[PDB]
A paper describes a structure:
Here we report the atomic resolution structures of [name] determined by cryo-EM in combination with GraDeR.
To construct a full gap junction channel of [name], particles showing the properties of docked junction channels were picked from the same set of cryo images. A model of the [name] gap junction channel was refined after fitting the atomic model of the [name] hemichannel into the density map of the [name] gap junction channel. The hexadecameric structure of the [name] gap junction channel appears similar to the Cx26 structure, a tsuzumi-shape. The channel height is estimated to be about 200 Å, which is smaller than that observed in [name]ΔN15. The extracellular docking surface of a hemichannel provides cavities to accommodate the E2 β-hairpins from the opposing hemichannel, which is reminiscent of a model previously proposed for connexin24. The narrowest constrictions are provided by the N-termini making a funnel configuration with an 18-Å diameter, and others are given by E1Hs.
Numbering used by the authors:
A (entry chain L): 50 to 51, 54 to 98
B (entry chain G): 7 to 51, 54 to 98
C (entry chain F): 7 to 51, 54 to 146
D (entry chain G), E (entry chain F), F (entry chain K): 245 to 292
Amino acid sequence: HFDPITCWTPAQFNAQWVNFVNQYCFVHGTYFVPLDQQLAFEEEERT
Amino acid sequence: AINSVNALISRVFVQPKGDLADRLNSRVTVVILAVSSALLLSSHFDPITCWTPAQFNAQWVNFVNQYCFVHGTYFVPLDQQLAFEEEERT
Amino acid sequence: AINSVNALISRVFVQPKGDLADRLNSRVTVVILAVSSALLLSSHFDPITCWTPAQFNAQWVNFVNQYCFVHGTYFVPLDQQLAFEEEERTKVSIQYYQWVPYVFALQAFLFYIPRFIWKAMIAYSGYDLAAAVKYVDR
Amino acid sequence: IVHCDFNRRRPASVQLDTVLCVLTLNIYYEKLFIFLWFWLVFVAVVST
Amino acid sequence: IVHCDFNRRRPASVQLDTVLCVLTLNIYYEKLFIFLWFWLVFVAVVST
Amino acid sequence: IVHCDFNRRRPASVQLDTVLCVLTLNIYYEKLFIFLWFWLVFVAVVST
């Protein structure tokens, strides 16, 4: 659309991490959960 | 800080007159419980410190510290998540 | 800071009356252990300082300092990496802070007991020395 | 080491969260409670 | 000089890490423990 | 002018709140929808 994906990161990242974690999120996988299940644990119910 | 008060000790610790055996344990008792009673509410003059996330401006930290100290607190061994509702958490 | 209390020393250090040889070592004992017991929990009034990485806002530093001081600590000689799990990391484990400052208070207390035993017991005998000592003395 | 609970109020109501606190006192209180316990129950048995 | 261990809690659970701390006290405690040790065990042998 | 809804996730779960947003588009869409409506239904009646 020349903002591929935007992310939420907590507040102490100096904004040169934001411009990182944005990409890193965009390459390494992502996933979904409907919301309020917590995450459980391990990889199973989360991913 | 550092402070030590002798005369308050010597006063009741001695001045009331009797040698009565092992009834003076009422005396020495009152001493210990009195002192520790005070020195604890002395707040070691940092009652409790807390972790708050990073955008609080430090006049909230000096709040959330107290607020934590008054409204209840609790414990969990660590890694259970928290579950939910009030049950397994509190 | 700097502070020195003499009268607390002189009080027990002298005022209880006896010259009894090498039993006064119970006295001087109670002194040493008492003092060091206190001056250690004085926190040199900087108990422990820690390294935390750079984005903590300094109200975490004043946290992680304590949190380190309570939850355990440990040691490794340096360069082993850490390995993993809990095994090779936490093998060499040093926390005595939960012990020293208080266990000394207990110490001094247990050196001062035996006197109290003595005065109580010799009082059981019904025949007091101390009166006699002062009397014939002066 | 505890997990403290905390509130705000906004148009969304309870709006609560947790922050884990270090706890210093609890090192005192359960340093002494032992001692004070021995010493009391002593004072009882010798006083009966 | 020690390596302290530390935790947070986020949706990812234990979330732990290490920070190496300098340790001042340990210079005291193992300055005195020697002395205090001599002096006690003395007090024993002279008191037996 | 609307009241938007919003979430986070912390150990306390839904953790939601509201923030009121200005809305620009809605000035467009209900500027044109009128016009476009006349013009369509016209195109119908003339096309039947």
